[PDB]
Design an enzyme around this catalytic site. Structure first.
Site, PDB file in Angstrom:
ATOM      1  N   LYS A  73     -27.016 -15.261  46.768  1.00 19.33           N
ATOM      2  CA  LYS A  73     -27.888 -14.789  45.810  1.00 19.33           C
ATOM      3  C   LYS A  73     -29.023 -15.712  45.316  1.00 19.33           C
ATOM      4  O   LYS A  73     -28.931 -16.265  44.146  1.00 19.33           O
ATOM      5  CB  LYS A  73     -27.057 -14.699  44.617  1.00 19.33           C
ATOM      6  CG  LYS A  73     -26.042 -13.141  44.886  1.00 19.33           C
ATOM      7  CD  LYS A  73     -26.915 -12.077  44.458  1.00 19.33           C
ATOM      8  CE  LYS A  73     -26.301 -10.653  45.083  1.00 19.33           C
ATOM      9  NZ  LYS A  73     -25.042 -10.400  44.741  1.00 19.33           N
ATOM     10  N   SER A 259     -30.768 -17.513  41.185  1.00 21.07           N
ATOM     11  CA  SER A 259     -30.816 -16.399  40.401  1.00 21.07           C
ATOM     12  C   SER A 259     -30.723 -16.823  38.837  1.00 21.07           C
ATOM     13  O   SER A 259     -31.526 -16.279  38.081  1.00 21.07           O
ATOM     14  CB  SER A 259     -29.549 -15.424  40.662  1.00 21.07           C
ATOM     15  OG  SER A 259     -28.574 -16.348  41.246  1.00 21.07           O
ATOM     16  N   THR A 459     -35.668  12.985  23.641  1.00 17.29           N
ATOM     17  CA  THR A 459     -34.652  13.088  24.500  1.00 17.29           C
ATOM     18  C   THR A 459     -34.379  11.893  25.207  1.00 17.29           C
ATOM     19  O   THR A 459     -33.473  11.525  25.539  1.00 17.29           O
ATOM     20  CB  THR A 459     -35.211  14.255  25.402  1.00 17.29           C
ATOM     21  OG1 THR A 459     -36.552  13.901  26.297  1.00 17.29           O
ATOM     22  CG2 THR A 459     -35.393  15.551  24.808  1.00 17.29           C
ATOM     23  N   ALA A 465     -40.064  15.706  29.001  1.00 18.82           N
ATOM     24  CA  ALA A 465     -39.446  16.362  28.117  1.00 18.82           C
ATOM     25  C   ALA A 465     -39.712  16.125  26.837  1.00 18.82           C
ATOM     26  O   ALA A 465     -40.227  17.196  26.135  1.00 18.82           O
ATOM     27  CB  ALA A 465     -37.782  15.850  28.283  1.00 18.82           C
TER      28      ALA A 465
END
EC number: 3.4.21.-
Length: 689
Positions: A73, A259, A459, A465
């Site tokens: 990772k 990471s 929303t 929207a």
């Protein structure tokens, strides 16, 4: 006062060597600081990083993939850039060279001596083998690819390959005693340059190197022409000709780190200065992108303008990109599965609520549409850009984004207008829903000017929207970006959990996902948009006309608004007037493009196709609809697809996001992002560049 040193790891000894100088030199100027950690090779080097000892270091495509993975990772902090004819880029063409005349071409490759930069590297393997794969006499992964490869050709020299069990593959090599077939500089022929040699010296007859290999090595135009270039059109073409001639294209080499607490920050500055203070053409003291005669590209590729910081969010998969990503799995995945994975769809869901639904669709469709959900909506997009997805419905608000990330619109959504209603829709051009504002029959002490800091019902952040249009207006109404303080208490999912904007939300029953843009949180979306001021927690709400009508007056069973009235709430027109929900059309903020599906350019058609079938199976007039599942049906909540939508239709000569949403909606939303900046977008911006 920053930090210690950047322990950059090394492959070959010569690697450790040339490095050192770097170290030395650095001190002379006194900027950052490193420390060349001695070790085996890249591969091994990876591990070293994932086991504190090391960190910084460059890796070829093929590696990176392998790099960021299960136990390691690791994410590419920065990609190196290269000019070499054309303009500065951060990707490269994968190609096949050979000597002039020979005779064969791409397909005829069987029964010859090849050349590979190193086992694994996208460049001299992944693509090569991959593109050739089709004809090979091999099945799935269980039986090592090596073998396959191994006895497809006559022989060759694939550095990191295993000679133990395998003969040929490590035969043609030039490695001395046991120094043969080393996944680092040691064994000669390793690398782009080396591998080039492999053919030059006659051992191999075809080399799979970089879109700018030869050049580097062979200067004098003279010789140069002595070799040609293989193009997938099953023919050969001039060396300089890799624009229409080339197996594939891959992302540039990039330095990878850990990471978390991988010292990202540090590394950057390190290279940063060094690539300016002693990069290319700078002081003579040291030459960054220039290795010795002996072996070429050391530490970093040989000759490359410099590097560029990869945006925090970009992860392995992401960076390499789908294109690559997908044709870099078949080599670890069987032949059967591939097909499956190809023809078939994977919808991306948001929120478990949807997840559950999604699931259903699978079995019903008999797995034809598999599923995979993410947290935020944005999170879903990624995956599609990563390829883990396939495509998902989408608000236009973000459609903008998706587009900007390359994907495009497929079919759209067709509500239901009571005229000559029935089946037409399929092709019937979609009009689009309208933006309006709703308050109450009570508090009539509010106008579009009087609003200030009331109780804003959104929303969600950055969506057709609500948010988008009004907010746009608020910037056309006032030249200030701070929409945070602008309105006192509200709920606009996707915003800071401790912000005036997000404020007023309410999470779940057991008070869970709070402010979370999705089903769970009951204050996100259309349905939830009313539940704002409906139960009186909110005030002026930001929704489209229909919203109201899909709950008030017995249009929804759920407690809250199971009996509210339509006439009750009003619209807050532009001049300053008011209107009822019944009378919409004139008192409308503006027209809003319909929502739609979107996918990876290439994966269009099929998708669409498949969808139609399913849309033909359980939709409006869908025969098998209530008998099992009603695609569009989402217990008055609007999951995946809306609820009003009666069908999915094409786009009247508009497939660009600029075209679908129209130049007006579009140019504007950019202006709105000038303040609030998106990371995903940001990413794409660098990625797509």
């Amino acid at each position: 006062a920053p930090r210690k040193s950047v322990r950059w790891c090394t492959i070959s000894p010569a690697e450790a060597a040339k490095c050192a100088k770097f170290q030395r030199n650095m001190k002379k100027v006194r900027g950052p600081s490193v420390s060349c950690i001695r070790k085996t090779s890249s591969f091994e080097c990876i591990q070293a990083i994932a086991a504190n000892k090391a960190d910084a270091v460059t890796l070829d495509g093929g590696l990176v993939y392998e790099a960021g993975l299960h136990p390691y990772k690791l994410r590419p902090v920065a990609a190196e850039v290269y000019q070499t004819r054309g303009k500065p880029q951060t990707r490269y063409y994968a190609v096949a060279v050979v000597k002039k005349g020979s005779g064969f071409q791409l397909n005829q490759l069987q029964g010859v001596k090849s050349c590979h930069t190193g086992l694994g590297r996208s460049a001299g393997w992944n693509i090569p083998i991959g593109t050739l794969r089709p004809y090979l006499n091999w099945t799935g992964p269980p039986e090592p690819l090596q073998k396959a490869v191994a006895n497809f050709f006559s022989a060759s020299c694939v550095p990191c390959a295993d000679g133990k069990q395998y003969p040929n593959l490590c035969r043609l090599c030039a490695g001395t005693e046991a120094d043969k077939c080393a996944c680092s500089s040691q064994e000669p022929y390793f690398g782009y340059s080396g591998a080039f040699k492999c053919l030059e010296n006659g051992a191999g007859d075809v080399a799979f190197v970089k879109d700018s290999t030869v050049f580097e090595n062979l200067p004098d135009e003279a010789e140069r022409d002595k070799y040609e270039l293989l193009c997938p059109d099953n023919t050969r073409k001039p060396v300089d000709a890799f624009k229409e001639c080339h197996l594939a294209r891959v992302p540039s080499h990039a330095v990878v780190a850990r990471s978390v607490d991988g010292r990202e920050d540090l590394i950057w500055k390190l290279l940063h200065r060094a690539q300016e203070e002693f990069g290319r053409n700078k002081s003579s003291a040291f030459q960054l992108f220039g290795s010795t005669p002996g072996e070429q590209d050391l530490l970093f590729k040989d000759s490359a303008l410099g590097f560029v910081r990869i945006p925090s969010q970009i992860d392995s998969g992401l960076y390499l990109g789908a294109n690559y990503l997908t044709a870099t799995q078949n080599l670890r995945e069987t032949a059967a599965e591939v097909a499956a994975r190809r023809e078939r769809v994977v919808w991306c869901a948001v929120g478990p609520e949807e997840e559950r639904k999604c699931k259903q669709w699978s079995d019903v469709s008999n797995r034809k549409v598999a599923c995979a959900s993410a947290s935020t909506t944005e999170e879903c997009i990624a995956l599609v850009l990563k390829g883990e997805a396939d495509a998902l419905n989408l608000d236009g608000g973000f459609i903008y984004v998706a587009g900007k990330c390359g994907l495009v619109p497929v079919l759209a959504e067709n509500q239901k207008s009571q005229n000559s209603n029935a089946p037409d829709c399929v092709h019937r051009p979609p009009e689009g829903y309208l933006a309006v504002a709703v308050v109450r029959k009570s508090d009539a002490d509010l106008t579009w000017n009087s609003l200030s800091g009331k109780k804003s019902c959104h929303t969600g952040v950055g969506r057709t929207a609500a948010w988008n249009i009004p907010m746009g207006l608020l910037f056309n109404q006032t030249g200030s970006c701070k929409f945070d303080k602008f309105f006192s208490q509200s709920c606009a999912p996707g915003a800071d959990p401790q912000s005036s904007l997000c404020a007023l939300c309410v999470g779940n029953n057991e008070n869970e996902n709070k402010c979370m843009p999705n089903s769970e949180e009951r204050y996100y979306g259309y349905t939830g948009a009313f539940r704002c001021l409906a139960e009186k927690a909110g005030d002026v709400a930001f929704v489209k006309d229909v919203t109201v009508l899909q709950n008030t007056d017995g249009k929804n069973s759920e407690p809250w608004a199971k009996d509210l009235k339509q006439e009750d709430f009003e619209l807050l027109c532009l001049d300053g007037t008011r209107k009822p929900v019944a009378e919409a059309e004139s008192c409308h903020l503006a027209r809003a493009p319909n929502h739609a599906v979107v996918s990876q350019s290439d994966r269009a058609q099929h998708l669409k196709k498949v969808l139609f079938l399913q849309q033909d199976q359980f939709g409006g007039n869908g025969p098998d609809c209530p008998g099992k599942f009603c695609l569009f049906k989402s217990e008055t909540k609007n999951l995946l697809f809306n609820d009003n939508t009666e069908c999915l239709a094409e786009l009247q000569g508009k497939t660009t996001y600029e075209q679908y949403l129209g130049s007006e909606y579009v140019t504007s939303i950019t202006n709105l992002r000038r303040c609030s900046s998106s990371p995903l977008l940001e990413a794409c911006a660098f990625l797509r560049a």
